[PDB]
Structures are given as C-alpha cells and as structure tokens.
Amino acid sequence: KVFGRCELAAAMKRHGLDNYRGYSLGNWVCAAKFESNFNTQATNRNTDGSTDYGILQINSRWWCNDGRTPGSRNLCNIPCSALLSSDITASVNCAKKIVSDGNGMNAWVAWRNRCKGTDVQAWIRGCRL
C-alpha cells in the first residue's frame, strides 16, 4: 500500500509516534518519505547482505527475521515480511524499539541525512490529525 502524506501522518499519530522520545510526527513522515516513498511494500538490499523492509526500511541485520541474513538478530521478534503489510502496526512497534535503542532516529541514516536539522513539520502541513 502507498500512503498519502497525511494518511501516513494520521496512522502514525494513531499508533503513538507523534513525539515518541521527543521526535515530532513530521520526523517520522519525513523518514518514511525518503526510506520508502510511503510504500509499505518497499524492499532494499544492504551491502552487508541484510535487507530493509517496509514503510521505514527496517533492517534484517538486527530487527526482523527474513530467513536469509547470516549472523543477524530479530530484536523485534517478527518476520520481516510483516513489515510489508498495509497495516503499519508491526513497523511502528518495531521503530519504537529501534528509536529507544540509544541512537534515536539516527538509526535511520536517511533521517539523519535528509530530515535532521530541517523543517520537518512541513511534512504534516495541512494535515487533519
């Protein structure tokens, strides 16, 4: 499923991400934008041979099990394929574990390089939340 900007903002707000650990909603919407262009089905292979999955490109090196990433963990305790559902619940749950892991949203290189230090609240502008 490909979300609208405000459609994703509102689902992410419903699921508790607005200001989770101090990261306003616009941060999460900006991350989704540059990770997956709002597409729950997005997949991309990393150089180390892990793969990233879903709306927030959550990676199989640490967070989920894809059955093919040697020397990896599954700290979110889920199949990576669960991150590709039109229901964003598992993505959201697993991102709350990720963003509490000590590096915050810096865990997402794309947030660090694309969203960090920008006017991220522009990503929820005009949205009914």
Curated annotation (Swiss-Prot):
Residues 1-129 form the C-type lysozyme domain. One of its GO terms (biological process) is defense response to bacterium. It comes from the Eukaryota. Its EC number is 3.2.1.17. It catalyses: Hydrolysis of (1->4)-beta-linkages between N-acetylmuramic acid and N-acetyl-D-glucosamine residues in a peptidoglycan and between N-acetyl-D-glucosamine residues in chitodextrins. Lysozyme C is capable of both hydrolysis and transglycosylation; it also shows a slight esterase activity. It acts rapidly on both peptide-substituted and unsubstituted peptidoglycan, and slowly on chitin oligosaccharides. This is Lysozyme C. It comes from Gallus gallus. The lineage of its organism: Eukaryota, Metazoa, Chordata, Craniata, Vertebrata. The gene is LYZ.
